[PDB]
Design an enzyme around this catalytic site. Sequence first.
Site, PDB file in Angstrom:
ATOM      1  N   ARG A 117      -7.995   2.318  10.237  1.00 14.05           N
ATOM      2  CA  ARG A 117      -7.664   0.925  10.558  1.00 14.05           C
ATOM      3  C   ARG A 117      -8.730   0.278  11.423  1.00 14.05           C
ATOM      4  NH1 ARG A 117      -2.137   1.188   9.114  1.00 14.05           N
ATOM      5  NH2 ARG A 117      -1.231  -0.743   9.936  1.00 14.05           N
ATOM      6  N   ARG A 119      13.031  -3.151   9.977  1.00 16.37           N
ATOM      7  CA  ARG A 119      12.184  -2.609  11.032  1.00 16.37           C
ATOM      8  C   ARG A 119      11.919  -3.686  12.078  1.00 16.37           C
ATOM      9  NH1 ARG A 119       7.040   0.027   8.151  1.00 16.37           N
ATOM     10  NH2 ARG A 119       6.238  -1.048  10.016  1.00 16.37           N
ATOM     11  N   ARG A 136       0.712  -8.513  13.974  1.00 17.07           N
ATOM     12  CA  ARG A 136       0.166  -7.500  13.071  1.00 17.07           C
ATOM     13  C   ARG A 136      -0.901  -8.074  12.140  1.00 17.07           C
ATOM     14  NH1 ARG A 136       5.201  -5.774  10.306  1.00 17.07           N
ATOM     15  NH2 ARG A 136       4.042  -4.223   9.081  1.00 17.07           N
ATOM     16  N   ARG A 192      11.425  -6.960   3.923  1.00 20.83           N
ATOM     17  CA  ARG A 192      11.374  -5.500   3.841  1.00 20.83           C
ATOM     18  C   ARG A 192      12.584  -4.848   4.504  1.00 20.83           C
ATOM     19  NH1 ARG A 192       5.978  -2.174   5.357  1.00 20.83           N
ATOM     20  NH2 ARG A 192       6.275  -3.020   7.473  1.00 20.83           N
ATOM     21  N   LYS A 208       0.807  -1.222   0.000  1.00 20.46           N
ATOM     22  CA  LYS A 208       0.000   0.000   0.000  1.00 20.46           C
ATOM     23  C   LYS A 208       0.840   1.272   0.000  1.00 20.46           C
ATOM     24  CE  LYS A 208      -2.150  -1.141   3.792  1.00 20.46           C
ATOM     25  NZ  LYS A 208      -1.268  -2.323   4.048  1.00 20.46           N
TER      26      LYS A 208
HETATM   27  N1  LIG Z   1      -4.591   4.264  11.497  1.00 26.52           N
HETATM   28  C1  LIG Z   1      -3.862   3.669  12.467  1.00 26.52           C
HETATM   29  N2  LIG Z   1      -4.419   3.309  13.641  1.00 26.52           N
HETATM   30  C2  LIG Z   1      -3.730   2.713  14.636  1.00 26.52           C
HETATM   31  N3  LIG Z   1      -2.422   2.410  14.529  1.00 26.52           N
HETATM   32  C3  LIG Z   1      -1.746   2.720  13.387  1.00 26.52           C
HETATM   33  C4  LIG Z   1      -2.428   3.366  12.265  1.00 26.52           C
HETATM   34  N4  LIG Z   1      -1.508   3.547  11.289  1.00 26.52           N
HETATM   35  C5  LIG Z   1      -0.332   3.032  11.751  1.00 26.52           C
HETATM   36  N5  LIG Z   1      -0.486   2.528  12.991  1.00 26.52           N
HETATM   37  C6  LIG Z   1       0.550   1.913  13.856  1.00 26.52           C
HETATM   38  O1  LIG Z   1       1.746   1.981  13.082  1.00 26.52           O
HETATM   39  C7  LIG Z   1       2.237   0.649  12.893  1.00 26.52           C
HETATM   40  C8  LIG Z   1       2.937   0.557  11.551  1.00 26.52           C
HETATM   41  O2  LIG Z   1       2.158   1.333  10.649  1.00 26.52           O
HETATM   42  P1  LIG Z   1       2.380   1.215   9.065  1.00 26.52           P
HETATM   43  O3  LIG Z   1       3.550   2.085   8.689  1.00 26.52           O
HETATM   44  O4  LIG Z   1       1.018   1.463   8.464  1.00 26.52           O
HETATM   45  O5  LIG Z   1       2.885  -0.322   9.001  1.00 26.52           O
HETATM   46  P2  LIG Z   1       2.579  -1.397   7.839  1.00 26.52           P
HETATM   47  O6  LIG Z   1       2.553  -0.562   6.574  1.00 26.52           O
HETATM   48  O7  LIG Z   1       3.747  -2.350   7.934  1.00 26.52           O
HETATM   49  O8  LIG Z   1       1.260  -2.017   8.240  1.00 26.52           O
HETATM   50  C9  LIG Z   1       0.994  -0.219  12.999  1.00 26.52           C
HETATM   51  O9  LIG Z   1       1.261  -1.592  13.319  1.00 26.52           O
HETATM   52  C10 LIG Z   1       0.244   0.456  14.116  1.00 26.52           C
HETATM   53  O10 LIG Z   1       0.802   0.085  15.389  1.00 26.52           O
HETATM   54  N1  LIG Z   2       3.899  -5.859  -5.778  1.00 26.90           N
HETATM   55  C1  LIG Z   2       4.942  -6.184  -4.979  1.00 26.90           C
HETATM   56  N2  LIG Z   2       5.639  -7.327  -5.158  1.00 26.90           N
HETATM   57  C2  LIG Z   2       6.678  -7.658  -4.374  1.00 26.90           C
HETATM   58  N3  LIG Z   2       7.119  -6.904  -3.357  1.00 26.90           N
HETATM   59  C3  LIG Z   2       6.512  -5.729  -3.075  1.00 26.90           C
HETATM   60  C4  LIG Z   2       5.371  -5.294  -3.883  1.00 26.90           C
HETATM   61  N4  LIG Z   2       4.970  -4.102  -3.378  1.00 26.90           N
HETATM   62  C5  LIG Z   2       5.787  -3.810  -2.327  1.00 26.90           C
HETATM   63  N5  LIG Z   2       6.710  -4.771  -2.170  1.00 26.90           N
HETATM   64  C6  LIG Z   2       7.745  -4.864  -1.127  1.00 26.90           C
HETATM   65  O1  LIG Z   2       7.021  -5.483  -0.060  1.00 26.90           O
HETATM   66  C7  LIG Z   2       7.266  -4.830   1.185  1.00 26.90           C
HETATM   67  C8  LIG Z   2       5.971  -4.211   1.710  1.00 26.90           C
HETATM   68  O2  LIG Z   2       5.588  -3.110   0.887  1.00 26.90           O
HETATM   69  P1  LIG Z   2       4.888  -1.798   1.565  1.00 26.90           P
HETATM   70  O3  LIG Z   2       4.548  -0.861   0.453  1.00 26.90           O
HETATM   71  O4  LIG Z   2       5.729  -1.377   2.753  1.00 26.90           O
HETATM   72  O5  LIG Z   2       3.527  -2.510   2.105  1.00 26.90           O
HETATM   73  P2  LIG Z   2       2.395  -1.854   3.098  1.00 26.90           P
HETATM   74  O6  LIG Z   2       2.534  -0.351   2.993  1.00 26.90           O
HETATM   75  O7  LIG Z   2       1.076  -2.382   2.570  1.00 26.90           O
HETATM   76  O8  LIG Z   2       2.735  -2.398   4.447  1.00 26.90           O
HETATM   77  C9  LIG Z   2       8.348  -3.808   0.893  1.00 26.90           C
HETATM   78  O9  LIG Z   2       9.593  -4.451   1.200  1.00 26.90           O
HETATM   79  C10 LIG Z   2       8.229  -3.530  -0.588  1.00 26.90           C
HETATM   80  O10 LIG Z   2       9.471  -3.164  -1.194  1.00 26.90           O
END
Ligand SMILES: Nc1ncnc2c1ncn2[C@@H]1O[C@H](COP(=O)(O)OP(=O)(O)O)[C@@H](O)[C@H]1O
Ligand SMILES: Nc1ncnc2c1ncn2[C@@H]1O[C@H](COP(=O)(O)OP(=O)(O)O)[C@@H](O)[C@H]1O
Length: 203
Positions: free
Chosen positions: A85, A150, A161, A124, A13
């Site tokens: 969320r 991370r 998660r 990642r 995303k």
């Molecule tokens: N809208 C939200 N509500 C509650 N917690 C959030 C929200 N957005 C992010 N977080 C917190 O930030 C952490 C990582 O966020 P994010 O960068 O969106 O991780 P990922 O893309 O790996 O899911 C989440 O696991 C949560 O603890």
């Molecule tokens: N279409 C895809 N195919 C394979 N790997 C991807 C793709 N999109 C993102 N990634 C990789 O997967 C991981 C998660 O992507 P990210 O955009 O952080 O997901 P989210 O924001 O939904 O948590 C990152 O390491 C990114 O480089």
Amino acid sequence: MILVFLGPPGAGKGTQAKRLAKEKGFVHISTGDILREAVQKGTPLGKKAKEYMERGELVPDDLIIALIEEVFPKHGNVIFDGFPRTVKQAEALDEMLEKKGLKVDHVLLFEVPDEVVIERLSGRRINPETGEVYHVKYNPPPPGVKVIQREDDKPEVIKKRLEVYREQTAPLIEYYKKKGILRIIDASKPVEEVYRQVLEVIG
Ligand SMILES: Nc1ncnc2c1ncn2[C@@H]1O[C@H](COP(=O)(O)OP(=O)(O)O)[C@@H](O)[C@H]1O
Ligand SMILES: Nc1ncnc2c1ncn2[C@@H]1O[C@H](COP(=O)(O)OP(=O)(O)O)[C@@H](O)[C@H]1O
């Protein structure tokens, strides 16, 4: 135009939102990115949010809702990326928007299996000083660019998660679907194919 990107952690995303924001003129609102900045800065929000994030739990709704009120763009197109969320967050977002004569236009659900999720999150890597996102297999970092993994991308925290997503965030699928604005994306495809799908639904 107001978009919400919805889907499991690791669905891609953030990757898609950054690209769409830069190419088509959206303000990109990443609650994860904003929270991580709050944490590095040690603001009251950062200090409180940090413990939930480390454990792979959602940060409390009231903190997130206040954050969005504080950062919501006055004009222009917006991608909410990783917000809402929870149902309470989605209800708060609809309420803010209604008072502005606005609404969520499309919600894109990034569908991907858990096994793909786990692979993407485990692989990642992030440039800790620029925030740029990599994957050790699907988008490796060039040698001599420092990257970290991370802490919430560790297997135990990924598991948590994903459980949290299925319990609290997945109900948003039906929430938005019954507004008629949900669009499905096969997010398991390669980046370019996922991006094509994204452009298709919003066009
Ligand atoms: N809208 C939200 N509500 C509650 N917690 C959030 C929200 N957005 C992010 N977080 C917190 O930030 C952490 C990582 O966020 P994010 O960068 O969106 O991780 P990922 O893309 O790996 O899911 C989440 O696991 C949560 O603890
Ligand atoms: N279409 C895809 N195919 C394979 N790997 C991807 C793709 N999109 C993102 N990634 C990789 O997967 C991981 C998660 O992507 P990210 O955009 O952080 O997901 P989210 O924001 O939904 O948590 C990152 O390491 C990114 O480089």
